């Protein structure tokens, strides 16, 4: 009696539990002992006055443009124009976009050089970009590509994110007008499959079309909402889960186990991946 446990790799759970007045969250993330980290995130409950910010990155192979994003894009975010204007959106906006545009300067390929490990880092190495932003009671979602975030709203899943891959109608549309094609497998060019990201700017060099208009795409699709008594949590997850359950399932698995004497946050997220069975989630459970 060996089943799949067999062909299983060795993994690792890294899990963590934080809370402040207005809300606790925990996190884990899953790796393999021999194949490399793809995922990073962030968590931070004292981002700036009455603010908190919460993302999760996803290299789809090589982890440094993802560690570099949770290393540099909260503090970059804050240096934005419509940042110090509370406007959120343009904001998340300006700041993937100006992020990412950075990914090409020298001295930023020489960090991102070191946290890879003729590879031009920045050009064939990038990621997927799901970023959570809570102002007061006002949360901003900003995705960019297949990571999700899920509130739990009057009792189901309600999508923050636009889900973004090659084959859906818009960002096909995009990658045709831009010269690009996609294969029968979901490949851009037979390469990468996915369609939005930071980096990878391989995928973004038609010097004709501005910056929101490249193949691949840094631009995150963004919504709000005003998070108040029927929204008890949200759930930031990379595809690695929402490839095995539905918004609605993991609303459900959440909900079957968040307020049991004991259960923390992360210890969720753990059981989560071994239903499912690099797996990253984020829980925030609203106070
Ligand atoms: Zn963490
Ligand atoms: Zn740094
Ligand atoms: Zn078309
Ligand atoms: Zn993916
Ligand atoms: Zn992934
Ligand atoms: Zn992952």
Same mark, same amino acid.
């Given at each position: 009696?060996?089943?799949?446990?067999?062909?299983?790799?060795?993994?690792?759970?890294?899990?963590?539990?934080?809370?402040?007045?207005?809300?606790?969250?925990?996190?884990?993330?899953?790796?393999?002992?021999?194949?490399?980290?793809?995922?990073?995130?962030?968590?931070?409950?004292?981002?700036?006055? !009455?603010?908190?910010?919460? #993302?999760?990155?996803?290299?789809?192979?090589?982890?440094?443009?993802?560690?570099?994003?949770?290393?540099? /894009?909260?503090?970059? /975010?804050?240096?934005?124009?419509?940042?110090? &204007?509370?406007?959120?959106?343009?904001?998340?906006?300006?700041? @993937?976009?100006?992020?990412?545009?950075?990914?090409?300067?020298?001295?930023?390929? *020489?960090?991102? +050089?070191?946290?890879? %490990?003729?590879? *031009?880092?920045?050009?064939?190495? %990038?990621?997927?970009?799901?970023?959570?932003?809570?102002?007061?009671?006002?949360?901003?979602?900003?995705?960019?590509?297949?990571?999700?975030?899920?509130?739990?709203?009057?009792?189901?899943?309600?999508?923050?994110?636009?889900?973004? +891959?090659?084959?859906?109608?818009?960002?096909?549309?995009?990658?045709?007008? #831009?010269?690009?094609?996609?294969?029968?497998?979901? &490949?851009?060019?037979?390469?990468?499959?996915?369609? &939005?990201?930071?980096?990878?700017? %391989?995928?973004?060099?038609?010097?004709?079309?501005?910056?929101?208009?490249?193949?691949?795409?840094? /631009?995150?699709?963004? *919504? +709000?909402?005003?998070?108040?008594?029927?929204?008890?949590?949200?759930? /930031?997850?990379?595809?690695?889960?929402?490839?095995?359950?539905?918004?609605?399932?993991?609303?459900?698995?959440? !909900?079957? &186990?968040?307020?049991?004497?004991?259960?923390?946050?992360?210890?969720?997220?753990?059981?989560? @991946?071994?239903?499912?069975?690099?797996?990253?989630?984020?829980?925030?459970?609203? +106070?």
């Amino acid at each position: 009696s060996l089943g799949a446990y067999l062909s299983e790799p060795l993994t690792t759970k890294d899990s963590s539990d934080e809370s402040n007045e207005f809300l606790a969250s925990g996190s884990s993330s899953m790796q393999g002992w021999r194949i490399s980290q793809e995922d990073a995130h962030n968590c931070i409950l004292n981002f700036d006055d !009455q603010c908190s910010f919460f #993302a999760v990155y996803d290299g789809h192979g090589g982890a440094e443009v993802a560690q570099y994003c949770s290393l540099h /894009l909260p503090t970059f /975010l804050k240096t934005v124009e419509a940042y110090g &204007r509370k406007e959120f959106e343009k904001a998340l906006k300006e700041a @993937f976009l100006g992020f990412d545009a950075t990914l090409l300067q020298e001295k930023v390929i *020489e960090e991102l +050089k070191v946290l890879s %490990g003729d590879a *031009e880092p920045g050009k064939d190495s %990038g990621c997927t970009a799901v970023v959570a932003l809570l102002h007061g009671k006002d949360l901003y979602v900003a995705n960019a590509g297949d990571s999700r975030c899920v509130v739990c709203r009057n009792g189901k899943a309600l999508e923050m994110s636009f889900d973004h +891959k090659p084959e859906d109608t818009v960002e096909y549309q995009r990658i045709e007008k #831009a010269g690009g094609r996609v294969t029968l497998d979901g &490949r851009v060019n037979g390469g990468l499959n996915l369609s &939005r990201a930071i980096g990878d700017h %391989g995928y973004k060099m038609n010097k004709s079309l501005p910056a929101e208009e490249q193949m691949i795409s840094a /631009l995150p699709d963004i *919504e +709000k909402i005003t998070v108040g008594p029927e929204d008890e949590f949200m759930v /930031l997850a990379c595809d690695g889960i929402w490839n095995f359950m539905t918004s609605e399932q993991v609303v459900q698995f959440v !909900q079957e &186990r968040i307020n049991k004497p004991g259960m923390k946050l992360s210890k969720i997220c753990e059981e989560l @991946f071994d239903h499912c069975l690099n797996m990253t989630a984020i829980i925030v459970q609203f +106070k």
